[PDB]
Amino acid sequence: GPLGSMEDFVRQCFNPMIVELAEKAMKEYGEDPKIETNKFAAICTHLEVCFMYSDFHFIDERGESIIVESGDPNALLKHRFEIIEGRDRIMAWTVVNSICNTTGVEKPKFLPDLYDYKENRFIEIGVTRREVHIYYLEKANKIKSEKTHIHIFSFTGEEMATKADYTLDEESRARIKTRLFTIRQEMASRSLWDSFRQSE
Numbered sequence: 001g002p003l004g005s006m007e008d009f010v011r012q013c014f015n016p017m018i019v020e021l022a023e024k025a026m027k028e029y030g031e032d033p034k035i036e037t038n039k040f041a042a043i044c045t046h047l048e049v050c051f052m053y054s055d056f057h058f059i060d061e062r063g064e065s066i067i068v069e070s071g072d073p074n075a076l077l078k079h080r081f082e083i084i085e086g087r088d089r090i091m092a093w094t095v096v097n098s099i100c101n102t103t104g105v106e107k108p109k110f111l112p113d114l115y116d117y118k119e120n121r122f123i124e125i126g127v128t129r130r131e132v133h134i135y136y137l138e139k140a141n142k143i144k145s146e147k148t149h150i151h152i153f154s155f156t157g158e159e160m161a162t163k164a165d166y167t168l169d170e171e172s173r174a175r176i177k178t179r180l181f182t183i184r185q186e187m188a189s190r191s192l193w194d195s196f197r198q199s200e
């Protein structure tokens with residue numbers, strides 16, 4: 001079939017909020033979304049996974065973790081996760097440092113992606129086009145804070161997480177895996193997938 005452009009794919013398949021946050025982060029780090037196009041799509045994918053991991057997860061009046069998929073959560077409900085990724089570096093560290101001084105959790109070396117108020121830990125999310133164990137070790141070796149929990153998703157449905165602790169229920173992780181499958185299938189229909197996979 002015809003080869004599409006990754007630019008077109010990104011603009012058509014991701015929410016404009018995600019796209020804009022991704023462009024901003026690439027510029028903050030000196031990379032151009034119109035040149036590092038596979039990376040642009042990967043950043044959008046990862047940021048969407050971070051949002052989707054957080055989506056619908058609250059802590060209720062009693063203090064228990066619950067899932068609320070309707071648009072209207074009860075007003076006493078608190079988001080279960082803090083989202084770090086997507087913020088610029090000053091704001092991301094502002095949020096991190098705050099969590100740390102409050103909850104007593106130590107400060108990590110690098111910016112993580114989320115904070116889980118139920119499990120009381122930072123989370124690093126990984127999304128990979130390669131074997132999950134390989135990518136797991138890369139992230140583990142990089143941060144080595146050893147309090148930050150790591151959760152890796154691949155595009156073919158495999159997952160790996162610290163201490164075989166997957167944090168979320170099967171249905172939540174299934175939403176993420178379905179979305180990843182969709183991204184891959186659509187990239188493939190546009191003849192973008194092989195290259196995107198190989199560029200990681």
Ligand SMILES: COc1cccc(C2=NC(=O)C(O)=CC2)c1
Nearest residue numbers: 025026029031043046113125126
């Ligand atoms: C300019 O490059 C950027 C910009 C913003 C995010 C990220 C990533 N963050 C991750 O947590 C992650 O796991 C992969 C990539 C990379």
Ligand SMILES: [Mn+2]
Nearest residue numbers: 025085086111
């Ligand atoms: Mn970031």
Ligand SMILES: [Mn+2]
Nearest residue numbers: 085111112113
């Ligand atoms: Mn991150």
Ligand SMILES: [Mn+2]
Nearest residue numbers: 113124125126
């Ligand atoms: Mn990450």
